[PDB]
Amino acid sequence: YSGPKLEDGKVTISFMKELMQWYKDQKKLHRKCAYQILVQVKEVLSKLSTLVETTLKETEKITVCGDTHGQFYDLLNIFELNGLPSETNPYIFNGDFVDRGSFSVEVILTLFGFKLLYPDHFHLLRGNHETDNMNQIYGFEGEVKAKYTAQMYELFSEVFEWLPLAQCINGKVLIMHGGLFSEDGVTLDDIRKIERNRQPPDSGPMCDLLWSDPQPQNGRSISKRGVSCQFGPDVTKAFLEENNLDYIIRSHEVKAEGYEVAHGGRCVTVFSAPNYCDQMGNKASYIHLQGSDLRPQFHQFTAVPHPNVKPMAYA
Ligand SMILES: C[C@]1(C(=O)O)[C@@H]2CC[C@@H](O2)[C@@]1(C)C(=O)O
């Protein structure tokens, strides 16, 4: 084996550079190195709150991405358009890193390496696809078994359970994959206290965080997805008021332009998988936020070429 190796058993910037190129060229990280990454990142993630709370100083910026769904070559394109992660260039990836796209292993191990290299400046939040039920149907479980083993898949499932469920920037912007709640009165402290190391329940706030969607009319509706609900602009306004927040940023729905701003400004969708499943034809975006001005700035981008492997090839 002549591929990327850890230095004195730890990730370094020179290792991360070697790995992205290794993967671009369709090569596999040695199982021993993938193991060390998974055990080290479980350790780091298991120490974090369910609600990650981040302060951005007035000269600091952060980038927010939505669903990536194993589109590794579009992930590389984000880093080329927007720069490598670093202490001065932090990132948040907002769930659904795996499933649907056929380079989910490359996406998740690159994201984990950067989490290890920059633990205070590189942030991962759980999506509805970081779960067993979903991985078993939509491709990730099949992909890991094909490249590694069932055992390695079990380790991934365990690591995913330690992903935090939401992130609050400067006590003003709350970020989750799905959205708000099926009941009125949920608070930030309620989120902090969720015992998250598990597969999510069929109902309740951990379910809602990963699964809900906005609707335009006031009220709530039963979801067409069969779990959680659709929430109206009355629900969003009430939640922001109680928790002294400005707005929310969520993902979980494909948008033709890469983003959407619903509820009069209060409920932003960001989606980071362009030409989703090689079929949608949609643009993607990421958001920039700055400590001195937390209003979202949208940066759009389009799909780049990838090797000839079809979506869901491992599903
Ligand atoms: C179809 C999708 C998925 O299965 O995750 C994929 C396309 C939009 C969004 O991401 C989606 C609806 C989601 O469930 O989060």
Ligand SMILES: [Zn+2]
């Ligand atoms: Zn989703």
Ligand SMILES: [Zn+2]
């Ligand atoms: Zn998704």
